[PDB]
């Protein structure tokens, strides 16, 4: 799982 | 921004 | 599963 | 933008 | 499964 | 824009 | 399967 | 511009 | 199944 | 402009 | 900026 | 298990 | 900056 | 277990 | 600064 | 355990 | 400044 | 065990 | 070969 | 509706 | 092979 | 409605 | 293969 | 929704 | 393999 | 949601 | 191989 | 929510 | 393997 | 809440 | 191995 | 709270 | 090895 | 609180 | 090996 | 409080 928020 | 990998 | 939003 | 990949 | 909304 | 490809 | 809109 | 191919 | 409206 | 193969 | 994985 | 925010 | 890895 | 918060 | 390690 | 506070 | 090992 | 306190 | 649009 | 059964 | 778009 | 099976 | 978009 | 199968 | 996304 | 089974 | 995200 | 089973 | 995150 | 089982 | 952060 | 079992 | 921090 | 058993 | 500081 | 058995 690899999540990213900017 | 906003991704996802499962 | 492979998910943006931007 | 909104993209999904299953 | 492949979608895009732009 | 709008596409599918299933 | 495969659609696009414009 | 609407199109679909099944 | 080909359709394309413009 | 309309047009559908089958 | 907010990421994980796992 | 590897997390970030800024 | 808040960062934690297990 | 490793963490940092600045 | 504030950080831990086990 | 290594912790450290400043 | 406040530290600890064990 | 190791401990400082400044 | 079984197809049909409507 | 599209729809092909071979 | 069966496929359905609506 | 997206459906394929094979 | 069994697949399904909504 | 967005599923798959194999 | 089974996948979903929702 | 995101899910995999393998 | 198990994995979820909410 | 992050959960991975192997 | 079985690991978790919230 | 972060845990591994190994 | 059998590891824990809250 | 952080704990370690080996 | 057992070890907690809290 | 910091505890270690070996 | 059996240690604690609080 | 710091204790230590060997």
Do not use: E, G
Request: aromatic share 16%; net charge neutral.
């Amino acid at each position: 799982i690899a999540t990213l928020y900017v």
